[PDB]
RNA sequence: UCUCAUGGAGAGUUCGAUCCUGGCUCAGGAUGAACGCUGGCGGCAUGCUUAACACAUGCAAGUCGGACGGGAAGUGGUGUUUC
């Protein structure tokens, strides 16, 4: 239970004889502020509908996002979703949450108020909002790293 | 849980609609600036980017008499002296 925020909205159409089927797209990207990330595509002839399947389909995918003391990424990392490849760095406190239209609010949305990203690929969002999923699952803390490598932390520091 | 990092935002347009590819356009900052409308003061700076085209007028490199000969002025037409 929590808020959730449309990122886009787009009518679709179809050639039947009659005419034409002009029915919505919605996407939704879904985030408590606190890690439990979602996003989320629905479809429907009326624009409400469209964002209540939408709103069904990102909580029926939630991810938690790594951050550090500060809501922060523990580093950088790249990811591509098609022709869709977003780019993702950390930053320092204070400096804020910049990116693109489609990589703003699904980080706006997460809790992370401190970092910086940069699409290089398709401007759309869909392609670009799942790109960031797939950014950070492929992301960790540094004690994920040191128990998978038998390490402390203090040592990998230096 | 250290420290480093003070830094990369997009948007519209091909299609009935979608995902791509690829050009065009915009949001930023700057100027030896110019034009338009308007206009109170102060401080620090700047001011022919074109015809290295042609120029009236005035000035912009003179100085030493303690280097020398002469000359002039003044004075009591005499000494010192000034030019
Ligand atoms: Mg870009
Ligand atoms: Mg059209
Ligand atoms: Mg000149
Ligand atoms: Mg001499």
Redesign the pocket.
């Known amino acids: 239970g929590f808020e959730e925020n449309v990122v886009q909205v787009?009518?679709?159409?179809?050639?039947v004889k009659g005419g034409?089927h002009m029915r919505f797209?919605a996407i939704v990207v879904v985030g408590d502020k606190k890690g439990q990330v979602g996003v989320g595509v629905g479809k429907a002839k009326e624009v409400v509908s469209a964002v209540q399947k939408a709103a069904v389909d990102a909580r029926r995918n939630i991810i938690t996002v790594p951050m550090?003391?500060?809501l922060?990424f523990?580093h950088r990392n790249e990811a591509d979703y098609?022709?869709?490849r977003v780019?993702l760095?950390?930053?320092?406190?204070?400096?804020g949450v910049?990116?693109?239209?489609?990589?703003?609010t699904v980080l706006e949305m997460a809790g992370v108020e401190?970092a910086?990203?940069?699409?290089?690929?398709?401007?759309?969002?869909?392609?670009?909002a799942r790109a960031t999923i797939v950014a950070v699952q492929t992301m960790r803390?540094?004690?994920d790293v040191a128990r998978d490598r038998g390490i402390?932390?203090?040592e990998?520091?230096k």
Request: no cysteine; aromatic share 6%.
């Open positions: 787009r009518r679709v159409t179809k050639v034409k797209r550090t003391k500060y922060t523990p098609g022709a869709a780019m760095r950390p930053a320092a406190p204070g400096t910049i990116a693109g239209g489609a990589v703003r401190n910086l990203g940069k699409q290089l690929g398709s401007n759309n969002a869909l392609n670009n803390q540094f004690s402390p932390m203090e990998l520091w």
